[PDB]
From a paper:
In contrast, under post-treatment conditions, [name] binds to the fibril surface without disrupting the overall fibril architecture, while still inducing localized structural perturbations. In addition, CD spectroscopy and negative stain EM imaging confirmed that fibrils remained structurally unchanged after post-treatment with [name], even after 96 hours of incubation at 37 °C. Interestingly, the cryo-EM structures revealed an additional weak non-proteinaceous density within the fibril’s central cavity, going from 0.31 without [name] to 0.51 in the post-treatment fibril condition to 0.73 in the pre-treatment fibril condition. DNP NHHC spectra reveal that, under post-treatment with [name], the compound binds to Cγ atoms of Ile and the Cγ and Cδ atoms of Lys28. These residues are located within the loop region and exposed on the fibril surface, indicating that [name] interacts with the fibril at the surface under these conditions. Therefore, binding to the central cavity cannot be definitively confirmed or excluded under the post-treatment condition. Isothermal titration calorimetry (ITC) thermodynamically characterized the surface binding of [name] to L1 Aβ₄₀ fibrils, revealing exothermic binding with a dissociation constant (Kd) of 0.64 μM and a stoichiometry of ~0.72 molecules per monomer. The observed substoichiometric binding ratio can be explained with multiple binding sites for [name] in surface-exposed regions of the fibril, rather than the central cavity. However, the attenuation of loop residue signals in room-temperature CP spectra suggests that [name] binding enhances the dynamic motion of the loop rather than inducing static structural changes. Furthermore, Gly25, located within the central cavity, shows a loss of hydration, consistent with displacement of water from the cavity upon [name] binding. This interpretation is supported by the loss of the Asp23–Lys28 salt bridge on the loop surface, suggesting that [name] binding correlates with increased loop flexibility.
Therapeutic antibodies can slow down the disease, but are associated with potential severe side effects, motivating the development of small molecules to halt disease progression. This study investigates the interaction between the clinical drug candidate small molecule [name] and lipidic Aβ₄₀ fibrils of type 1 (L1). The L1 Aβ₄₀ fibrils consist of two protofilaments that share an identical fold and are symmetrically twisted together, forming a double-protofilament helical structure. Each monomer is composed of three β-strands, with a long transition region (Ala21-Gly33, hereafter referred to as the loop region) located between the 2nd β-strand (β2: Lys16-Phe20) and the 3rd β-strand (β3: Leu34-Val36). A cavity is formed at the interface between the protofilaments arranged with 2 fold symmetry, with the loop regions from each monomer contributing to cavity formation.
Numbering used by the authors:
A (entry chain I), B (entry chain G), C (entry chain E), D (entry chain C), E (entry chain A), F (entry chain H), ...: 1 to 40
The structure:
């Protein structure tokens, strides 16, 4: 007369989570505050 | 008459989590505060 | 009449977690505060 | 009539955690406070 | 009538943790406070 | 019979140039690549 | 019979130039690549 | 019969140049590659 | 009959140049590659 | 009949140049490659 109970508040089987962040808040290109040339 | 109970608040089986962060807050390119040339 | 109870608040089986951080807060490129040339 | 109880608040089996940090807060490129040339 | 109890607050089996830090806070590239040339 | 010539290719008198750069390419606030919480 | 010539290709008198750059390419506020919470 | 010639390719009188760079490419705030909490 | 010639390719009188760089490429705030807490 | 010639390729009178670099490439704040706590 087995109970054979399984009682898990959370059960997870076979879960793959990938979190990928690429290039957040980053500079791959020029940031210049001022360019000044040719000033007489 | 076995209970055969399994009672786990959390059960995790076979979980892969990948957290990848690439290039957060980083410079791969030029940041210049000022460029000044040719000033007479 | 075995209980055969398993009672674990957390059970983890076969979990792989990869945390990868690459290039956080880093410079691979030029940062210059000032460039000044040609000033007369 | 065995209890066969397993009672572990935390059970971990077969867990691999990799934490990788590469290049946090680091310079592989030029940081110059000032470049000044050609000043007369 | 064996209890066969296992009662461990923490049980860990087969856990590999790798913590890798490479190049935190480090310079592999030039940091110059000032470059000044050609000043007359 | 004085020539009284003044012959200057460039003449500058009384010139003030201010170049100000503030906060180019800079972080005064949080940059986070990932925030992850509450994952079961 | 004075020439009293003044012959300057450029003459500048009393010139003030202000170049101000504030907050170019900069973060004063949060940039987050991902926020993830409550994932079961 | 004086020439009284002044012949200067560049003449500068009374010139003040201020170049100010503040906070180029710099962090005054948090950069985090990953924040991960509460992972079961 | 004096020539009274002045012949200077560059003449500079009374010139003040200030180059100021503050906080180029620098951290006054936290950079963290990973923060991980609460992982079961 | 004096020539009274002055012939200087460069003449500089009364020039003050200040180059100031503060905090180039420097850490006044925490850089941490990893923080890991609470891992079971």
């Amino acid at each position: 007369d087995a109970e054979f109970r399984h009682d898990s508040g959370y059960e997870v089987h076979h879960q793959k989570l990938v979190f990928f962040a690429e290039d957040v808040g980053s500079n791959k290109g020029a940031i210049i505050g001022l360019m000044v040339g040719g000033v007489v």
